[PDB]
Design a protein around this ligand. Structure first.
Ligand SMILES: *[C@@H]1O[C@H](CO)[C@@H](O)[C@H](O)[C@H]1NC(C)=O
Lengths: 253, 36, 11
C-alpha cells in the first residue's frame, strides 16, 4: 500500500495472507468470507505468462495477522488448503477479466477478536454503494512504493471509486463490466494505491444502512503504483457472485 | 458463505460489536452523500 | 525477512 497508514489491531479481521511454503514469502492478500472459504485473485495463483501455477500444496493461508513477518503466536491461525477453484472464464491472456478464485480450507477456522468474516454484497447493497466519489478501503502488506519499502505491519488506505469513462481513458487495456477502478485524480491533492503484494486483497465498504462491512472488490491490477493519471483496478465481486454461490453450494461442507 | 451466509459477517469484534469506531471510517461514511 | 513458522504446518 502506497501512502497509507498503519492499521489498528483488529481493524480488518477478514484480511488473509497468502503465504508460499518454500521459499517462504508473501504471495498476495485474500479475504475470509466464512469459516472455511477464502476469496482472492485468480492471478495470484495462475498466470502462465510468468510460469505461475500454484497448487493447494504450495501454499498456506495465515489469518488474524497484523505484523507482516512475525509468527504471531496465540493470535494468528495458519491453515492448509483443501481445494482451489479458479473462475472458468478468467482471462489471463488479455486483461485479467474475471480475476477471482475461491480456496477451501482443510479445516474450519475458529473466529476470535482478530479473525472474523466480511460480508458479500447483495444486489441492493452494490447498487447503493458502488458509485463514483464513494470511498472504499484497501488493506495489505504489499510494497510501500513502486520500487522499494516493505511495511512492518498491515497498511490501510481509503480510496474513491472513479467514473468508468475516466478509468477507460487512463489505460490502453480493454476494461470490462467485471472491473471497476479506484484512486484519486491528479488534481485532488490526495493519493494512495495498492502495490505489489496487495493483490488478491479486499476493497471493502461499510454500509450506512446496517453498519456492516461488505467486500465490493478484489485488488486485481494496476500499471505501476500510485502514478498520477493512473488507477487501480478491482474485480467486481457482485457481478461474479452467482459463480461464488455456485462453488460453495456444490463443494461446501 | 455466499452473501446469505454468516448472520454475523462484517461486524468486527473490536469495533462494531463494542460500538467503537476506527480512526478513519468516518471518512468513508462522509463520502456516501445521498444515502443517510 | 519472515520468522519461521511451526513445522506442524509444513508437513
Ligand atoms: C497448472 O497445473 C495443473 C496441475 O497441477 C495443470 O492441470 C494445469 O494445466 C496448469 N495450468 C496451466 C499451465 O494452464
Amino acid at each position: 500500500i502506497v501512502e497509507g497508514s498503519d492499521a489498528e489491531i483488529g481493524m480488518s479481521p477478514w484480511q488473509v495472507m497468502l503465504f508460499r511454503k518454500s521459499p517462504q514469502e508473501l504471495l498476495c492478500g485474500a479475504s475470509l468470507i466464512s469459516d472455511r472459504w477464502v476469496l482472492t485473485a485468480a492471478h495470484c495463483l495462475l498466470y502462465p505468462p510468468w510460469d505461475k501455477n500454484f497448487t493447494e500444496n504450495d501454499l498456506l493461508v495465515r489469518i488474524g495477522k497484523h505484523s507482516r513477518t512475525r509468527y504471531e503466536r496465540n493470535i494468528e491461525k495458519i491453515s492448509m488448503l483443501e481445494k482451489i477453484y479458479i473462475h472458468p472464464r478468467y482471462n489471463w491472456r488479455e486483461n485479467l477479466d474475471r480475476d477471482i478464485a475461491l480456496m477451501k480450507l482443510k479445516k474450519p477456522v475458529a473466529f476470535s477478536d482478530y479473525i472474523h468474516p466480511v460480508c458479500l454484497p447483495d444486489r441492493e447493497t452494490a447498487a447503493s454503494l458502488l458509485q463514483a466519489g464513494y470511498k472504499g478501503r484497501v488493506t495489505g502488506w504489499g510494497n510501500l512504493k513502486e520500487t522499494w519499502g516493505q511495511p512492518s505491519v498491515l497498511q490501510v488506505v481509503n480510496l474513491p471509486i472513479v467514473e468508468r469513462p475516466v478509468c477507460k481513458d487512463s489505460t490502453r487495456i480493454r476494461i470490462t463490466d467485471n472491473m471497476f477502478c479506484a484512486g484519486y485524480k491528479p488534481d485532488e491533492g490526495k493519493r494512495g494505491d495498492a502495490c505489489e503484494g496487495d493483490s488478491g486483497g479486499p476493497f471493502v465498504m461499510k454500509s450506512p444502512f446496517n453498519n456492516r462491512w461488505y467486500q465490493m472488490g478484489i485488488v486485481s491490477w494496476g500499471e505501476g503504483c500510485d502514478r498520477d493519471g493512473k488507477y487501480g483496478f478491482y474485480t467486481h465481486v457482485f457481478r461474479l457472485k452467482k459463480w461464488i454461490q455456485k462453488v460453495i453450494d456444490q463443494f461446501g461442507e | 458463505t455466499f452473501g446469505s451466509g454468516e448472520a454475523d459477517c462484517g461486524l468486527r469484534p473490536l469495533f462494531e460489536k463494542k460500538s467503537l469506531e476506527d480512526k478513519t471510517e468516518r471518512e468513508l461514511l462522509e463520502s456516501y452523500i445521498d444515502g443517510r | 525477512d519472515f520468522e519461521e513458522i511451526p513445522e506442524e504446518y509444513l508437513q
